[PDB]
Amino acid sequence: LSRRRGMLKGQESEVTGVKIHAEVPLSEMFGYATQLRSLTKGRASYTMEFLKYDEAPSNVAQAVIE
Amino acid sequence: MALNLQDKQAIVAEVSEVAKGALSAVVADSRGVTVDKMTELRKAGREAGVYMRVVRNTLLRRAVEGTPFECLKDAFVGPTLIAYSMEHPGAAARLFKEFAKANAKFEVKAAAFEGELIPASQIDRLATLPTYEEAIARLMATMKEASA
Amino acid sequence: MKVRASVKKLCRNCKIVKRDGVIRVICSAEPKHKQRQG
Amino acid sequence: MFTINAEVRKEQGKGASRRLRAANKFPAIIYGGKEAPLAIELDHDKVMNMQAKAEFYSEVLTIVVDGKEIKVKAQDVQRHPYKPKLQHIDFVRA
Amino acid sequence: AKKVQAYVKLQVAAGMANPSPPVGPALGQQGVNIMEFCKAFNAKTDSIEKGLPIPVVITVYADRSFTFVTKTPPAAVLLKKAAGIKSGSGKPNKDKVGKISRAQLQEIAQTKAADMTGADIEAMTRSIEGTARSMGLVVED
RNA sequence: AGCCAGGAUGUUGGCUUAGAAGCAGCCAUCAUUUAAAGAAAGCGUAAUAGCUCACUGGUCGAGUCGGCCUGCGCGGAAGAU
């Protein structure tokens, strides 16, 4: 989550798993499922929805040039 | 470590406990944990506090350097690992007792309790002790003698 | 193993050994620290 | 307290001075008082270890030059331009 | 206790022993019973006080049920509700910010008499010095 | 130097962090209990956990540690009939 240019915000330890809470950019979550699986032996749901817009890191920004 | 100016204090202090003491016990702390000391310090605790010690020193070279003073019955204790215990006030007391009861809770060996000095001799757990103030065992020896 | 010209201990467990004509470094904890051509 | 044995210099000049220094000696000079100056040659490693203590430069100190005890103070030192060694010393007569 | 076996201490709360987001499940799930810390804890809760920090150890092997133990509060924390400020800096401790109650530190430490090594209860104070020079907050002694 | 032991209590110091529990950073680095044991020299951890060190007790039984200056050597060092 951190590697994915992400900010973390909480942990519960909800019963058996451990819900982890984070704000992580869209252009960076692509194909999460695939790897989240690899990291947790297949045992790991996840979910996401829109939250906000924040500044894009420069190398990102100057890349995003049409 | 420290030079002599410090190997001398561990002497002049520790030997004026013998010169000004009461009872002596014994014990070899191979496996001496720290829950070990913790406890026995509360025991020294009950047994006043800091009236007691155990200063590991069995370097013959140390807590025998306090022996050709008094208790030369200890040229024979001092070999191998040892934990010397001195009494200042208190009865020739219970100090004796829990060392056997302690180490008989596994709490490591007791040197087979090579024993020590009140008399000038060796081993054998005695509660010939802290009855002390059991002069009541000579109060009950009154009315019962007067009556019976 | 790394080869290098300057070799030197890395971990506290790296050891330095002169086998044949060549100076070496052996680490019992961390394979990455092996060194030769010293 | 510093006792420095020494010998009067039999040779002077750039030539000798260098020679001395090849043999772990090193020249120095005592001057001061109303009497003439004196050309000394000192054992190097000794003065080195001595001058390691700061007292060397403060205390009065004594030089036993052919059995006399001249008793002087360190005025000036010449250290090697890039080594840990001494080149020369000025001693003031006290 | 002459033999440790399993202990995890995550300061709970008295007034209702029934968490869920903080601890809840994670306090009892490996041979431990969530049903019995509201049958048993609260049996040792109301005799004293309720609401504030409770570290704790329990006696669970793999034996189904268990028996609950008690403990003691953190010591630099008795410098919150038992001193003043509740953080500890605000100006990172490049600045010596805090402020002390010399009267307190003995009897407020003494409240932690059952978990300290000093024979001299005054000694148990001298420990609280550094515990309370934890920022560099001077005591108006 | 080996080998046996211990290597602890305030306490996850404080701050800061999603988490900094001896050990990412910042400031502090005291006080206990002691034979000795750093508010920690390294491994480790998501963080704890876990393994070591410093230090002291035991064993052993006479030498031993590491800087300064200098002589001679070692690596560094691959080329074409």
Notable characteristics:
part of a larger assembly; 5 chains; D: alpha/beta; Ribosomal Protein L25, Chain P; six-stranded mixed sheet; E: 141 residues; Ribosomal protein L11, N-terminal domain; Arc Repressor Mutant, subunit A; 2 domains; two-stranded antiparallel ribbon; 2 strands; RNA-binding
Structure, briefly:
Chain B is mainly alpha-helical and 148 residues long.
Describe this structure in words.
- The structure is cut from a larger assembly and holds chains A (66 residues), B (148 residues), C (38 residues), D (94 residues) and E (141 residues).
- The radius of gyration of chain A is 14 Å and the shape is elongated.
- By secondary structure, chain A is α+β, with helices and mostly antiparallel strands.
- Chain B has 148 residues and is mostly helical.
- The radius of gyration of chain B is 17 Å and the shape is globular.
- Chain D is an alpha/beta fold and 94 residues long.
- Chain D has a single domain, classed as Ribosomal Protein L25, Chain P, CATH 2.40.240.
- In chain D, 22% of the residues lie in helices and 41% in strands.
- Chain D is globular, with a radius of gyration of 12 Å.
- At the A-E interface, loops of A face loops of E.
- Chain E binds one RNA strand of 81 nucleotides through α2.
What secondary-structure arrangement, pairings included, does this model have?
This is part of a larger assembly, with chains A (66 residues), B (148 residues), C (38 residues), D (94 residues) and E (141 residues).
Chain A lengths: L6 E4 L10 E3 L8 H8 L18 H6 L3
Antiparallel strand pairs in A: 1-2
Chain B lengths: L3 H4 L1 H10 L15 H13 L13 H4 L31 H9 L36 H8 L1
Chain C lengths: L16 E3 L2 E3 L14
Chain E binds one RNA strand of 81 nucleotides through helix 2.
